Design brief:
The structure is a homohexamer.
Chain A lengths: L4 E6 L1 H5 L3 H11 L2 E8 L3 H7 L9 H8 L4 E7 L3 H9 L12 H5 L8 E3 L3 H11 L13 H4 L2
Antiparallel strand pairs in A: 1-3, 1-4, 2-3
Chain lengths: 151, 150, 151, 151, 150, 151
C-alpha cells in the first residue's frame, strides 16, 4: 500500500506561471516522497503518446500542440493513497468546480489552462510513469520521517 | 470574459490587516485588478449599499457600522469572476465557510465577516457603478492572459 | 456563547514533524483566543484516560501506546463556536477524507498519524479541558481585537 | 511622530507580476496603517513630474516611458518611522544589492524592473503624497491595534 | 549541543496573534521545543524578570506593562540556539531590524517589540530556571536530529 | 548577460527535510527561469567527481559518503546575475552566519547539513552544469514574463 506511486505533471502554463515549487511543496508537506523528477519540452510524438486515449477527439491536435508548446515538469510521488491524495490536492479538473485550498482552486480558471495533471487511478499511474520515465530514473530511498507519517 | 465583480473589504477586514491577503488571493487565481480605493463610507453611501435591506430589522445599526471606518473597494475582471470571487471569499456565514477561503481562514461571526463579493453579474454591475466613476476603472491587458485563459 | 472553549492537542507526530506553530497560527488567524498551553509526554495512564470512550475498541491499545510515545502540545482555545470551528480547521479525522486547506488535508495521510486532536463536542471539551489543565493554568484575558471579530 | 506618512507605489512590472497584495500585506503585518489607495496608468506628464528630480539624467526618458506604460498602484501608509521602514521593507533600490526578506530581494532582478517605489525622505514623501492624492482622498482613521503597536 | 535558550512572546505579540508564527520559525530552523506555557505574569514575576533594571527610569511602568496580560514562555534546544534565536528575532530595536526576522517583519517601536530572547547562555539558564520547574521541561529526541545536526 | 546560468543542488538533508519545493519557489518568485531538473542518488564516483577540488582533504571521504547517502535534486537556473543572486538567496555557506530570509538562514544550523549548494562563480557554474547534465537535458524556452522581469 505505501509503495503506491502517482504521476504528476506541471503543464506548460503551470511552468510559465512559476508554480512548480508551490506544487512540489504541497506534496512534500502532505508527507509524500519524491522519487522522479525532470523538466522537458514534450515533442509532438511525446504529446500524442501521452494523450493516446484522446487521439480520436476533434480537439486532439490542439491539445497536442499546446502540451508540446513549452516545458512541463514530470514527477513521481510515492506513498500510501498517493493517487487519490494527489487528485484531491490538485482539485477538480475543471477549475470552475475546484475548491480553494487545492492547486486548481487557488491558481486556475480555465480547463485548458488548469496548471497540473495527476494520474486518475493506480492503473493509469503505472502507465504514465513508465511512459515518461525509464526504470533507472526512479530513485529508491527511505524517508527519515516515514514512521511519523505512516502507521 | 470581460466579466467583472465588486469586492469590498469591510471595516473589520481593514482593521484586522486583511486587505493585502485578499488582493493576493485574487491575483494568484489569475484575475485582473481594474479598480481600487479606500474610503470611509458616508451615511448615504452605506444606506445606498444596503438599500435592499431598508425594510429589514436593525437597518440603522448596519448603516452606522458600515460607515464607522474605512473599507477597501475593488473591481476584478476575468472569466467567471463573479462566481469564483464568491467561492474564494467562502460562505457568507463564517460558521459554514471552508478552510482555504477568506472567511474560512479568518472569520467567526456573520456580523464580522471581513469582506463582501457581488452575488451576480447584475449586482456586480450595480455595485461597480455605485462605488466607482468610469474613469477610475483601468483598462489594461495582463501579460499572462494567454497562460490563464483559453 | 463567546466564552465557549475547546481542547486541541498536537499529537506526537505533529510535534515530531514541526507542525506546532502552524497549528497555533491557524487558530490565531481565525480569531480565536489562546487561554492554556503546555508541552508534556502523556503517561500510559493519561493516554488511557484521554481515550476512555474508546476503551472497548481493538485499536485502543495502539492509540494509547502512540499517544504516550513522545511529547504532545496541549491547548485550550476560546471563542464563539470554537468547538465546531476547531474541528473544521483540523479537518476530517481520517486524513483520507480531509480537504486541502485543513490541517489534516494539508499535512496528514494515515489516521493513526493524524497530527492533532480537537474536542468533538462542548461536553467532550469540558471533560478534556478538566482532564489536562487545572483551573489556575487557564489564563483569563481580553483580546484587543474582540469587537473586530465578534459583533 | 506617529502621524508620519510615506508614499509607496507598485510600479507597472509589480502590478503585471501580481505583487500588489503581497506588498500591501507586508506593510499591514509590520503594523502600518493604510490611508490612501488607488490604481491608475500615469500619463507621460505625471511620470515626468514624479521623476522631476531626475530630469537631467540620461535614463530619465526610459524611466518615464516605463512608468507610464501601464497601471500602478499608489498608496499612502502612516505610522512611526514609516518612511525609513518603508524603504527597508522594499529593500535596496538596485535589486542586485537587495537582501532576501525584502520585496526587491525576494522578487526583483533588474533596477529598471524593481517592482515598487517608496519615498526616500519625509520631504520627498510630503511632495509625492501631494502630487498623487488630493486631501479628500486620504482617509483619517484609528487602528484598533494602535496601543499594541506603539507605546 | 544541548544548549537551550528562553524565548518569550511579550503581551503585544500575544495580543497581535504572533505566537504561532514565532514558534514556526524556530521549528523550521530545526530547533527543538522543550517547554511551553502561557500565563499573565504577576507583579512579582515581572519585577524578577526586569530585576537588572530596578534602578533604571520608569521601572514601575515596565513592571505594570509586562504584568498586564498573558505572555508565552518557551524553551528551545539545539546547537547555537542562543545566538541563532537572537538572529531570528532580529535587532531588539525594531527600527534597526532586518525584514525576514520577527521584529523586522512585525514591529515598529522598541516599547512594543513583540518578543524577547536570552542574550547569552548564562542569561538563558537564569531565565529558564525563573519561569519553569525542572519537570515542565520535556526530554525527547527529534527524529530529524541527524538531518539537522552534524 | 541574461543567458547566464547557475547550478543549484538540494543536498540529501534538504531532500529528507522536504525543502525541495520551497527552494524552487524562491528562485521562481525571484524571476529566474528553470532549465534543468532531476532527482538522483549520487554514486560514490559522482560524489568524488563533484568534490574533485577537495579530494586532498582529510574530510573528503566523509563528505563523499554523506553526499552519496541519498537523493539530491539538481537544478539549473537561467537569467541575468543568477550566479550571484543564487548565492544571495541561499545565504552564507555556514548557517551560523546566514541571515533570516535566506534558505540557510531560515532552515539550517550546521555547515555539514546546510541544505543546498549553489555555484560560487560563472566559471564554476559552467563546470557544475556540464558535470551533472548532458546538453540534451537543458530546456531552451522563453518565459512569457521576460519583459516584466528584465530591462
Amino acid at each position: 500500500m505505501s509503495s503506491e506511486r502517482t504521476f504528476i505533471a506541471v503543464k506548460p502554463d503551470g511552468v510559465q506561471r512559476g508554480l512548480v515549487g508551490e506544487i512540489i511543496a504541497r506534496f512534500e508537506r502532505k508527507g509524500y516522497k519524491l522519487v522522479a523528477l525532470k523538466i522537458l519540452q514534450p515533442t509532438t510524438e511525446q504529446a500524442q503518446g501521452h494523450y493516446k486515449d484522446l487521439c480520436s477527439k476533434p480537439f486532439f491536435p490542439a491539445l497536442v500542440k499546446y502540451f508540446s508548446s513549452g516545458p512541463i515538469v514530470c514527477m513521481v510521488w510515492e506513498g500510501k493513497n498517493v493517487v487519490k491524495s494527489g487528485r484531491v490536492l490538485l482539485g477538480a479538473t475543471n477549475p470552475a468546480d475546484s475548491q480553494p485550498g487545492t492547486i486548481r482552486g487557488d491558481f486556475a480558471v480555465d480547463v485548458g489552462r488548469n496548471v497540473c495533471h495527476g494520474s486518475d487511478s493506480v492503473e493509469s499511474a503505472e502507465r504514465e510513469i513508465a511512459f515518461w520515465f525509464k526504470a533507472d530514473e526512479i530513485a529508491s530511498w527511505t524517508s527519515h520521517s516515514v514512521s511519523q507519517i505512516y502507521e
